[PDB]
Write a protein that binds this DNA or RNA. Structure first.
Ligand code: MG
Ligand code: MG
Ligand code: MG
Ligand code: MG
Ligand code: MG
Ligand code: MG
Ligand code: MG
Ligand code: MG
Ligand code: MG
Ligand code: MG
Ligand code: MG
Ligand code: MG
Ligand code: MG
Ligand code: MG
Ligand code: MG
Ligand code: MG
Ligand code: MG
Ligand code: MG
Ligand code: MG
Ligand code: MG
Ligand code: MG
Ligand code: MG
Ligand code: MG
Lengths: 129, 88, 172, 224
RNA sequence: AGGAGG
RNA sequence: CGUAAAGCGCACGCAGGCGGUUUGUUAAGUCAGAUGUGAAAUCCCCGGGCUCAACCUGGGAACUGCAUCUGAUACUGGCAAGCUUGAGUCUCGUAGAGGGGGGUAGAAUUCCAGGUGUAGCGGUGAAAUGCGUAGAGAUCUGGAGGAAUACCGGUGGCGAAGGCGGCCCCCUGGACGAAGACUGACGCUCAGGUGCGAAAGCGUGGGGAGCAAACAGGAUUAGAUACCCUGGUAGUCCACGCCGUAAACGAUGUCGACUUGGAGGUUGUGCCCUUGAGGCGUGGCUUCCGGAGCUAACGCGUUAAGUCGACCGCCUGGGGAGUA
């Protein structure tokens, strides 16, 4: 059964970028919305919108630069079968800094650089490059 | 395969509404009625393994629903097993 | 673009396999080049236009099509023009000519174990079983004959079962 | 021209919807008669791209190689390019014209020696099994290479019809960087084509429209 | 549906 | 982990692992900070001293830890409420060699009784063994009995797998579709355990037409304890019990999500026009080709061997050995 909606979201985005779909649609969640916020505000997707009040459907618009996809790689790290928690001084680097590591810290979902700014650790939700 | 009238009686005697066909006690009562009915069939058809598989599936579904009921609301579970005569 | 709805109107003119304008803008005694129909230039053989029966009346500009045998078999509109525009005797199969009133040309060759008779000026049907003709007599008319009459007698699979009748009997 | 000429020609035709290479999917409008329909609503602005493009290419007077092989459009191409004095291949694409130009150039230079012979430069010599053997040798060369004999070096722009039917030239051009202009129907895949021209290919009522409208624009990048 | 094929 | 070693034969299922969605609460996990310790030396950094170095030293850092305390509480966990899109029930129908029990039908081989009827039959690459003048073979009539169900028949259907095909009846399991209502995460996987599990085989009691291990004879051959021929017992058949293995194979574990197509097959369901069994959709299962991608390649390719998640099984050179 669906035992990781976050991995489902990342896989949907990965497959959509592979298949050149303009938008990818999925069921919504608080955590999914937060991750979409992070991705949008660091420019890996254009826009996202959640429509529906009983079955909220989230739509993410994917972006491609010179024809190629932008989200060249997107990996789920802290999966249900093996949760990963890191401290502020072992927060990972993605692409040696160019990439991002979406991290759920005690103050919300927010990337590894921002967590190092705010002196927080947390759960490494995913890597994006 | 319970008869339609038997299903209606079970729903009427175990559910709050006559259209309450999905309630946990309604489902467990339906499964118990079918299992009791099928016991006599499998007393005389020992080699009906394919049907025995469906009977075992109903047994396991009833067990799962009973565990759900017990860990959710205990009093309903106890009243149900009292009215149905199931040991546990 | 409902501007191509005036061309959705051009779609109406002629669209499914049926009578079509049949622009013969190009011509040659090799492959009569039909153009109108659906697709662009065509590639049809010849059986009533050139090098076929000897009738040269399709001079560049004649406008007969070929009942659009294919809407488009892939850059290929229609094919052989056996009897496609003036199918005055058959059409679907035979049940519906166009008038059925005047005696149209008919031929009655009997069943040489089958028939293989050009019963109509346009088709050649094989007939099943008895009553091959109208029934004065069944297996005793193997002459092409002449224009006497024409009627229906016994169809079957409604494909190549074109059934003609011309003996001027009680017309059974 | 716009939808007006595009329809009185048939640019709107597309193969059966059971052959359609799915990469065309943006360019189609529907499926009338189990057969696709090419917008002529995106084409017209997109066909305009190549038009105002060959202007630029002929502006530097670069060499424009026309390509067509189907018997349907074989005669369209030859008369269209010579209407502009540009190069064309109306018969089978001799596999290797572009990547193997260092070898194909030998083919031209040998027919260019030959045709001087066959007309005036001492043809009528003995062994009349030799005379015709040139006549069939020259004819075969001229028939497939005589299109581009004066061409010199490699082209700078390459205009084809049926990207599918002629996918060798596209694979040769793309491997040489030369831009590729194509007309791609529903059975083709423009993934090699630089400037696509989406719409019906096989024709002369429609193809002399693509060529005749292109043939001009080369001249007015050449008349300047 | 005779033959094809042959 | 398709073919190199490697998916249990297939299921059910306890413990265990994992868990859809919203609000509230808790602060266990988690994170931050502080305190106490985590001996000295050794490693490392900055220095100092032996003529330099080895060496010896001063100070630091580190000792990834653990215990409290104070905060955050997004995510996981608990707790309490809910929600429905997962899961399940009911209502109507559907198609099917799904299973168990019982009966019966016709064709055919064999045998028995008889009639006609003669010298061959049967067999092979040839032949012989074998059958036949005690009257065979052939043909006809009437019985007996056992087994299997021609045509339909279909890379068709059902089943978890093994498997299941004449017709009829009784009992019975599963799948699926349409519309609605209902319950409200009741779920996915599964070590050990339990059940089912072709064929051969075993035990008891039956049955025994045909076929046929073993066996015998003839032939072939250098030999022929084989292929071929002529016979033939166990066994194939039934009831019950046991075995528990197969190239138990789509050599591809189960569940879920997403990712261009095309041609079919089969089973429902909707619209219109059933206006010619038509198109137009939508579900389920199934066959072939192929795209991106993947693969060592062969190949797979929306029924993935593509992109991911959950759980389980399994592999670690060949032989010895799946043996002791
Ligand atoms: Mg092997
Ligand atoms: Mg292996
Ligand atoms: Mg398996
Ligand atoms: Mg959860
Ligand atoms: Mg120390
Ligand atoms: Mg919570
Ligand atoms: Mg086990
Ligand atoms: Mg057995
Ligand atoms: Mg034994
Ligand atoms: Mg036995
Ligand atoms: Mg026995
Ligand atoms: Mg016997
Ligand atoms: Mg022997
Ligand atoms: Mg034998
Ligand atoms: Mg085994
Ligand atoms: Mg098998
Ligand atoms: Mg198999
Ligand atoms: Mg295996
Ligand atoms: Mg399971
Ligand atoms: Mg199936
Ligand atoms: Mg394939
Ligand atoms: Mg592999
Ligand atoms: Mg052993």
């Amino acid at each position: 059964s669906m035992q990781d909606p976050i991995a489902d979201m990342l896989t949907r985005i990965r497959n959509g970028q592979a298949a050149n779909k303009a938008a990818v649609t999925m069921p919504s969640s608080k955590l999914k919305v937060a991750i979409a916020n992070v991705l949008k505000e660091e420019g890996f997707i254009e826009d996202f919108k959640v429509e529906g009040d009983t079955k909220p459907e989230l739509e993410l618009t994917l972006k491609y630069f010179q024809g190629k996809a932008v989200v060249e790689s997107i990996q789920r790290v802290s999966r249900p079968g093996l949760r990963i928690y890191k401290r502020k001084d072992e927060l990972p680097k993605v692409m040696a800094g160019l990439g991002i590591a979406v991290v759920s810290t005690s103050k919300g979902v927010m990337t590894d650089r921002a967590a190092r700014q705010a002196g927080l650790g947390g759960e490494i939700i995913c890597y994006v490059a | 395969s319970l008869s339609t009238e038997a299903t209606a009686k079970i729903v009427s005697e175990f559910g709050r509404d006559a259209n309450d066909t999905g309630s946990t006690e309604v489902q467990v009562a339906l499964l118990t009625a079918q299992i009791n009915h099928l016991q006599g069939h499998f007393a005389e058809h020992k080699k009906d393994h394919h049907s025995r598989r469906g009977l075992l599936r109903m047994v396991s579904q009833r067990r799962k629903l009973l565990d759900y009921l017990k860990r959710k609301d205990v009093a309903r579970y106890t009243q149900l097993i009292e009215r149905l005569g199931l040991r546990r | 673009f409902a501007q191509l709805f005036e061309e959705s109107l051009k779609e109406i003119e002629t669209r499914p396999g049926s009578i079509v304008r049949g622009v013969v803008v190009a011509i040659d005694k090799d492959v009569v080049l039909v153009d109108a129909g659906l697709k662009s230039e065509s590639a049809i053989p010849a059986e009533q236009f050139k090098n076929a029966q000897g009738e040269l009346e399709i001079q560049v500009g004649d406008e007969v099509d070929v009942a659009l045998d294919a809407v488009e078999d892939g850059f290929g509109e229609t094919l052989l023009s056996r009897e496609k525009a003036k199918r005055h005797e058959a059409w679907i199969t035979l049940e519906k000519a166009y008038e059925d009133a005047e005696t149209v040309t008919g031929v009655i060759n009997g069943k040489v174990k089958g028939g293989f008779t050009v019963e109509l000026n346009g088709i050649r049907a094989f007939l099943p079983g008895s009553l091959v003709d109208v029934r004065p007599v069944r297996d005793t008319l193997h002459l092409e004959g002449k224009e006497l009459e024409f009627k229906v007698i016994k169809l079957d699979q409604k494909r190549n079962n074109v059934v003609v009748s011309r003996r001027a009997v009680i017309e059974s | 021209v716009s939808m007006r000429d595009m329809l009185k020609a048939g640019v709107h035709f597309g193969h059966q919807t059971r052959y359609w290479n799915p990469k065309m999917k943006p360019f189609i409008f529907g499926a009338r008669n189990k057969v696709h329909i090419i917008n002529l609503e995106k084409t017209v602005p997109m066909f305009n791209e190549a038009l105002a493009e060959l202007n630029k290419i002929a502006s530097r007077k670069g060499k424009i190689l026309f390509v067509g092989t189907k018997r349907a459009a074989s005669e369209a191409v030859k008369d269209a390019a010579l209407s502009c004095d540009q190069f064309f291949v109306n018969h089978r694409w001799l596999g290797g014209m572009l990547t193997n130009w260092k070898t194909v150039r030998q083919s031209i230079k040998r027919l260019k020696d030959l045709e001087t012979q066959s007309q005036d430069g001492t043809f009528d010599k003995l062994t009349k099994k030799e005379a015709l053997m040139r006549t069939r040798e020259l004819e075969k060369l001229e028939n497939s290479l005589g299109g581009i004999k004066d061409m010199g070096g490699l082209p700078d722009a390459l205009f084809v019809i049926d990207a599918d039917h002629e996918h060798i030239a596209i694979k040769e051009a793309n491997n040489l960087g030369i831009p590729v202009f194509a007309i791609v129907d529903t059975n083709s895949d423009p993934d090699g084509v630089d400037f696509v021209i989406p719409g019906n290919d096989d024709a002369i009522r429609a193809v002399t429209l693509y060529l005749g409208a292109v043939a001009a624009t080369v001249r007015e990048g050449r008349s300047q």
